[PDB]
Design a protein around this ligand. Sequence first.
Ligand SMILES: *[C@@H]1O[C@H](CO)[C@@H](O[C@@H]2O[C@H](CO)[C@@H](O)[C@H](O)[C@H]2NC(C)=O)[C@H](O)[C@H]1NC(C)=O
Ligand SMILES: *[C@@H]1O[C@H](CO)[C@@H](O[C@@H]2O[C@H](CO)[C@@H](O)[C@H](O)[C@H]2NC(C)=O)[C@H](O)[C@H]1NC(C)=O
Ligand SMILES: *[C@@H]1O[C@H](CO)[C@@H](O[C@@H]2O[C@H](CO)[C@@H](O)[C@H](O)[C@H]2NC(C)=O)[C@H](O)[C@H]1NC(C)=O
Lengths: 165, 164, 170, 324, 324, 324
Amino acid sequence: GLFGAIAGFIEGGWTGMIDGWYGYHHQNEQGSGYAADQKSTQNAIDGITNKVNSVIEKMNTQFTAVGKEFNNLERRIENLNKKVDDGFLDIWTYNAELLVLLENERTLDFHDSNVRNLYEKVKSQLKNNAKEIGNGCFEFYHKCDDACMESVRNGTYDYPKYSEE
Amino acid sequence: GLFGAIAGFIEGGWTGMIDGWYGYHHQNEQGSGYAADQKSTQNAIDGITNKVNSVIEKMNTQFTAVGKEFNNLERRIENLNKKVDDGFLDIWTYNAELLVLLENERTLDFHDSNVRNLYEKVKSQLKNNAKEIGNGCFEFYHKCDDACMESVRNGTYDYPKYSE
Amino acid sequence: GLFGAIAGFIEGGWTGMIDGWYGYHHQNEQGSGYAADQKSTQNAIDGITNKVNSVIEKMNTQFTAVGKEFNNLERRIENLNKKVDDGFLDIWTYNAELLVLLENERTLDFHDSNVRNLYEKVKSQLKNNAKEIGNGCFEFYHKCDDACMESVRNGTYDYPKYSEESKLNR
Amino acid sequence: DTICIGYHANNSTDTVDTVLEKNVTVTHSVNLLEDSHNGKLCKLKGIAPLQLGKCNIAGWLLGNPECDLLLTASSWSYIVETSNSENGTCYPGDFIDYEELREQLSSVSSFEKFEIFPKTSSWPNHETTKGVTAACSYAGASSFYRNLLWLTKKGSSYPKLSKSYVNNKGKEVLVLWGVHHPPTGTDQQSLYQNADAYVSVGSSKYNRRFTPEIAARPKVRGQAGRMNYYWTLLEPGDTITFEATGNLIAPWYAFALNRGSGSGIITSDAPVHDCNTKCQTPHGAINSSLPFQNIHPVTIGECPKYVRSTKLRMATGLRNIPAR
Amino acid sequence: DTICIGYHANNSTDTVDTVLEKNVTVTHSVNLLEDSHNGKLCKLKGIAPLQLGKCNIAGWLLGNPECDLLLTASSWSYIVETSNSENGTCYPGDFIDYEELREQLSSVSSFEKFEIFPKTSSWPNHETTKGVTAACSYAGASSFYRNLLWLTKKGSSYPKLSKSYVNNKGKEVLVLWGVHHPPTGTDQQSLYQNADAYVSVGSSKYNRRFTPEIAARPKVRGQAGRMNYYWTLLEPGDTITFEATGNLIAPWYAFALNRGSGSGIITSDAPVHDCNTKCQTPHGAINSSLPFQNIHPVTIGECPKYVRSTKLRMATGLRNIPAR
Amino acid sequence: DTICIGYHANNSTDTVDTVLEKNVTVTHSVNLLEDSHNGKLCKLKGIAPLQLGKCNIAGWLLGNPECDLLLTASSWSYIVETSNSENGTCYPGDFIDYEELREQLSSVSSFEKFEIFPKTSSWPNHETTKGVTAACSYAGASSFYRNLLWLTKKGSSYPKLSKSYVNNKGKEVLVLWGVHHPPTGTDQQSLYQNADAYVSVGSSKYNRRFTPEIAARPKVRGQAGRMNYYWTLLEPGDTITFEATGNLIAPWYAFALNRGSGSGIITSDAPVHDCNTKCQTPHGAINSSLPFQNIHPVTIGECPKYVRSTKLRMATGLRNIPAR
Ligand SMILES: *[C@@H]1O[C@H](CO)[C@@H](O[C@@H]2O[C@H](CO)[C@@H](O)[C@H](O)[C@H]2NC(C)=O)[C@H](O)[C@H]1NC(C)=O
Ligand SMILES: *[C@@H]1O[C@H](CO)[C@@H](O[C@@H]2O[C@H](CO)[C@@H](O)[C@H](O)[C@H]2NC(C)=O)[C@H](O)[C@H]1NC(C)=O
Ligand SMILES: *[C@@H]1O[C@H](CO)[C@@H](O[C@@H]2O[C@H](CO)[C@@H](O)[C@H](O)[C@H]2NC(C)=O)[C@H](O)[C@H]1NC(C)=O
């Protein structure tokens, strides 16, 4: 990844999380489970849905486009006309493919960036009250319950602390 | 944002600062104020200025371009000529619009990156001598005066510290 | 740099490392030396190679392209023909240049990203057992020999195997 | 107690391509390239295309004896020639500006066929019969075009003929006629009677005089003589005048034209069926809202931009990594 | 003691678009799309355009009576026809290669008109008067083209005429002329006096022999007869020779041409004014250095590339968030 | 004990350009723009080009006396005209559809010249000698085209001629002829003994009558007379017939054509050399696999896309910062 999150410091994705693109695991004394982040997943969908629509608008459709006949003394005109059709075909085929190739790179890097920005929104929310294991995982110091979890995946932590060295 | 700085971990901008693009606040015992970074706003301006000029050079202007007449038995040649004009017009219109959309994306993310890079240049200059609050704010541990502030927004801190 | 790594927090490049694009330099009690990272240098080469080949494929060659003659009463047809040639030359010249400009940006920002990602892959392997100096350098707290060095540029550090760090940490 | 940040993954096997890497499995993607047609030629706006069959434009417009099915034709969504459209000009000769006339039928949605010079009242002083040929035979017998009339001498006499038509149809009238060119001065006499004949045609914008080009030529369909076909679009209210002392193939039927963009001529061997579409190609119809299609360049209606691409799948989701 | 890192903001309400998000308020941005014109047709390099008015190229060059204001014209920056430029060829007939002649005028910056064949000394044996028509009436009375001379028989005699001109102007000489086609053989005699006449014209690269196409046609502007207009660029040092036994509309005035790129012909109803510009369109002039403009495809001078876009604003500053 | 992370560097001075910054020194880069040629015109597929020299296509095909070296030409990879190819039509006149003929020759790889109407056996009743002119002089004496034959009257007698040829070559035959247009009726008789002459020519797809356009014209290469040159492609098994009562420049030698794409005509003053290449340009050959070249638009073979760019270098390595 260009931001090293996806296929990076978070080696894999969760087939278990099926309600969003990005989310949390959270293992508690009350149970496990998965939870997708509305905030960030919606923004992506709106962004991607917008990217696709922008591409389509730009590629105007094609109206009645038929060919022309030329007699045996109009070879220069027949070839000219043929040079134009193949000329425009070359260009549009180029633009079409080239555009997808580029945007696909931008889209995958987009998701990468999103996962990264999420991880670090959590990290700067917890600070001391937890430690970074590895695979994008935080281990709690102050024991957080199901009610407390939903305060983190909400952008509203509270930081009542003590630690445990 | 792509780099999560602008409209990210720094929720808003400062209508205050008007002498640059990026900068510092700094609240001291001697007062407050704003100060923009010459180093980074200059590079950004040299860059954006250059991106614009590059785009313009590529789009070669348009000299004398008039239309042709065709009699009633030249309808095929007339339509060919028409297919060429509308053809090139479709392509240039598409390029022009498509290029802007793309470079605008590149441009906003360019700024985002610049804010991010500046914040972490400071963070790697202070380390223990300050803590990260939230909105890209550093709280000092060792009390820094106006003379000391200008050493940070200078790239020349000194790191003499304590407690903490 | 878009990622602040190259020409950023790592100010300079190493003319001494000649076997790869990115790598390490450790300084040991057994000695110094340079070493390129296969894993990340190969993935860059494969990607860049791919980028170039993708570019060439899109720009298909040019077969027999000759000009046409016209008599003094086909000046409209001659100018239409001339308009189409100059017309397509303008576009293809544009694309060819514009494409390289963009991809050159993307490419340099690509390397920048790679250096950054490597640095942070090491930082996340070591954590406490070393302290960040500055120019992408890690100072050890637990004394790492040639054997241990290779374990880091291998992605297989053994962190818990170290609390001698905790000792030197103060 | 712990909490982890991760991303989505699924069983999707859709792959896309980027500039740095190919065949990258993703979670979600849209297909931009339409590659599925109908294999059928369908109606457009509820109106059926015109099948020319073994006849081409010239065969249809002149009235080749082999194209009698097209006599009824009045309106069409688009015109269809096949691989077997060979029946056009049955008597050997040139069809002046044929390619241009075709270009004109492209923007014609329908017409009203009418008898411009009624065969049985227009030529009191000339032989309206006898104007048949083995080249244009129909039902084993020598015949001729349905829309043209071969005027010959009436018992060793071919008086100067003059005949005009004023356009009252408030539309354009397509008038076709022919000029005959015999092999020898003898045939010229047997047919016309005047050795030094001419054909003159005049309208408000059309003025041209034709003289018999008698010569021996290689036999085509048994014919050593030639016959040149002409046409003109008579503007509303304009008059067209025919003068001749021989060699004139006079108009019999003409056409009142109704213009209308979006129409055209296509070459296809795909069958016609009772369906309706907004997009038609030689290979078949297309019901799609994708921006692209690799089926065919030639299009009639509202269609996706044609491209040579084999694949245009654009990524929407993220890199798919189940790592089970 | 604290220190914060942040970015700029202001009251700017400029919105740009990106591929991911539309209407994004930014702090700075340049407009690339020029959409403001002058509403006026202006000079170019200090030289004024040529207004044709109710006349078109044909009328101007031929000398149509309604186009007498243009007789003075000698130099122009560009040529301007309007919606009412209908006075061109007052006597019905074809202007052979008219669209081609126009294409030639497109690269002409000026010329020097002159009497190639002086009307009162070039034709001693023919009727130089009487060559007028109701189709070309002027001041209520019958007249004719100012640059052409309709020759006729001098009292029941039309002796073969020969008349050449050598190009000593050191430039191209545009020579125009015509060949008259009467309706009946009667008028042919009344006009020319030889029933079997001809018109031959020959230079170093031009050789053609015209013959009267006597026929009856619908009256156009009260004329059943026709007149076909011809032309040719005579090269420096080359001779042009006219021979005729009738039907010749001989050249009276000619044009010594001056080439110059950057010129052309436009169609505009906008008024001409005493201003200067480096860019001209049919809608008006443009004073801008922007790369693009959506005013008009047709352009004269140094102009921005025309584009259909409504808005082409590229961002230079950052996303604007005052968050008051 | 410590460990640092860094990146590559070297003495490389290659600079590239990006959108934000110019002249960026990098470690590695590839050049996409080919700007080096050969200075020489080379073979293609082992076959050498055809040097017209001081002759052009016209001179070569008609058999202009100055073009005798080309009489041996049978096969070529591509045709080369020079800056001095001024020897074509030596008797003044139009070469009808000459640019189209050149278009045809572009897809012709070789042909077999042959004597369609043998001089000393085809015309028992017309003068086969005397058909010479100073305009087509050769070796200080008056001569004529090699592939053409100027028939005249045989002792005050020009009987109507008729001569046909059947295409048995299993290819298309290129047939060329001419029609002569004298300056005066006196010459017409001296040449043809037949004041009212015509030339008729027809195959299965060709039919056209030519008539003497007697007239007085400026002398071109000492000739007030003119000669028009015509051509036709005779399909395999098709016949062509010639009838004339005068003025016919009869075909003497024709050409059986061999088709082959990938050929063409170029204009170049670069020398031919015994080398090979897969890409040829007017400036020289190109041995490269680069995607682009700024050498020339005109190309023959498999070549890199032409572009105006002066530099096209794309970065592969990273920024180069030795910082010694
Ligand atoms: C209609 O077209 C068909 C196909 O070209 C003609 O049939 C051929 O005619 C040629 C020339 O006489 C013959 O050599 C072939 O043997 C015929 N082929 C077939 C399949 O019949 C037919 O003559 C045309 N009829 C008319 C009236 O134009
Ligand atoms: C100059 O142009 C005007 C405008 O076309 C001509 O006026 C027309 O003349 C025709 C022929 O009689 C009339 O039927 C139209 O009604 C006229 N239109 C108008 C608007 O007046 C005029 O005849 C032309 N004169 C010359 C000498 O060319
Ligand atoms: C072949 O081409 C040469 C070169 O153009 C001709 O020589 C010119 O002939 C003209 C007309 O007689 C002279 O005015 C020029 O001065 C000649 N130029 C040169 C360089 O000699 C030559 O006449 C042509 N010969 C044939 C047989 O076509």
